[PDB]
């Protein structure tokens, strides 16, 4: 159209000037082109004008460093403004090769002892840094875009070597250093070849560098932690099977926590929180694979340490978990609490939440029935309680603001409830707040809030809950059942299972005082057929999980109504 | 019936240890003791004060094992702030160890607790 | 009472807030 006409008028010459086999005319022309190329609407023309090809084809191979550097900046800018597909296209022309070469050249420049780098002209080295910058960025976006690219990149050895070279020597600008650190973080995440590349590097020993960094007082320690964490988990350096020098995941948690101590750089904060949350899901992996004052007065004081102890633990085999609990969760709570004043700490709260959510859901998945995992239960129970009161009421007492935050704190409350089980504190009658939330909030199948409210509520209603609390809640669930006409099936499975977990023991006061007194078993015999219909009305192929779930629910319901009779 | 002994341990020599000391100092008023770990023992007024104050925190509900055959007892808290002490971000949060030795058995002391408090 | 379930950890596995990498503007 017309807009395009004015655009081509502006643009076309510049390309022709770059196109100029006046490689210096284009040192100045290409040098111009990145500035020219920032514009959004205009770019789509530029792209359609086949710039990508020209640059890739010509500019990068020129003998003048200003050419290549202008050209690598062109690509960078492009990939940034544009969308992921773009990078995937670059990967198709194997820009990777072009980069590998580029990085070899930077690497020879740094590591060289003949010129050598440090004695280079001021703008000389500034040019290298400019080139490195674009190179880094590209690898970032390319790795991120797709998996098969993330692999392809963690295969080009020269690339890794360069990233190590920088991170290790720390003689480049902080914007560049930090960019390198990031780039390694992406590549190192849930990837093995990179995990090993960093550990197995004896050339610069980039590992020991990171360790030191994430260990000490350096302002950048957190970033180091992000990488190192990715590594530990990538090669499974965990509690049950530590790395060299017992490098478990645990050792990071102090520095992360100290990064939290100060908030009352800003990016540094968010990052640490994010790490801690990942540590949460990843010690899931730990637990899966696992299965006149002195002297002897102190000695004795270790006699009372049997009681769950603040300072150190029974948990010699699980330092990760104790560090989380002992150190991390204090600060996680405080941050979950403190004021909602800006949107920045709104984010920080949503994070600290996500973290506690993670940890708590991980642990809550274990077995604790009878004396199972007693030690773990004994360390967690206190903390689960503290979390409950300290962070779950206040946000519920506020009735303040957000919806998705409600999902957050609801999901969390579910986790805590899964562990606490009727031993869970009752103040301001929270089960009513949640029930209200269920009705007022009236995708993936089981992400819906109704489910999460069914869950937490049916959890806190176990024996020995206040018999009245028990009553109202059981009532709400059975209510759901009678009027199951519009309730999503997921919520049926959760409701069924909730009641099954609450009223399976006749020896419980609520069995008689509530279940029998209000004659639930009638309503159950009422729903048995309804359940069978909705069950058969579910697609075992799209999707099977829900179907099989309901099936077992019907069996146990089917079984349990039958059982329910067994006892009058 | 003598002393209350609050106790912290930090395997990492350093900042985090001089900070634990600072907490026990301002909380007891006494300059604390060092061992890998700090602690401070407090007798008389302040002891009953700090005892109850953190016993509050534990909702006055203990278990039966913490009491020693010598009729003593203790508990942990993890947030030295839940006892009305503010938060100094150049200090952070620390956990504390609480320990009460009685004189003039387990039975007699459990019963003693039940009567007062 | 008694009950039947299987592979539960998988079920609730999903809820862990999950993260992967990736923005800012204005200069």
Numbering used by the authors:
A (entry chain A): 26 to 289, 301 to 327, 385 to 535, 549 to 674
B (entry chain C): 15 to 49, 66 to 134, 155 to 167
C (entry chain B): 2 to 23, 26 to 30
Provide the publication's sentences verbatim.
Typical examples are the r-proteins RpL5 and RpL11 which, together with the 5S RNA, form the 5S RNP. It concomitantly binds RpL5 and RpL11 in the cytoplasm, traverses the nuclear pore via the import receptor Kap104 and transfers its cargo onto the 5S RNA. Syo1 forms an elongated α-solenoid by an unusual combination of four complete ARM repeats and six HEAT repeats. Syo1 chaperones 5S RNP and masks the major binding site of RpL11 for the 60S ribosomal subunit.
As a first step to understand how RpL11 interacts within the Syo1–RpL5–RpL11 complex, we determined the crystal structure of Chaetomium thermophilum RpL11 (residues 15–167) in complex with RpL5-N (residues 2–30) and Syo1 (residues 26–674). Here we report the crystal structure of the Syo1–RpL5–RpL11 complex, which shows that both cargos of Syo1 simultaneously bind to opposing sites of its α-solenoid structure. The symportin Syo1 is an α-solenoid that binds RpL5 and RpL11 on opposite sites of the HEAT repeats, whereas the ARM repeats are not involved in cargo binding. RpL5-N (residues 2–30) interacts as a linear motif with an elongated structure and a short helix (Tyr12 to Phe16). In the ternary complex, residues Phe3 to Asn9 are relocated from HEAT repeat 1 and 2 to HEAT repeat 3 and 4 compared with the previous structure, and RpL5-N becomes more solvent exposed. RpL11 localizes at the convex side of Syo1 with about 1,160 Å2 buried surface area. The first one (interface I) involves a helical segment in the acidic loop of Syo1 (HS, amino acids Glu389 to Gly399) and the carboxyl C-terminal end of the acidic loop, which was disordered in the Syo1–RpL5-N structure (left). The RpL11 β-sheet forms a groove, which accommodates the Syo1-HS. The second one (interface II) involves the Syo1 HEAT repeats 1 to 3 (right). Superposition of our ternary Syo1 complex with 5S RNP bound to the 60S ribosomal subunit16 shows that H84 and the Syo1-HS share the same binding site on RpL11 (left and middle).
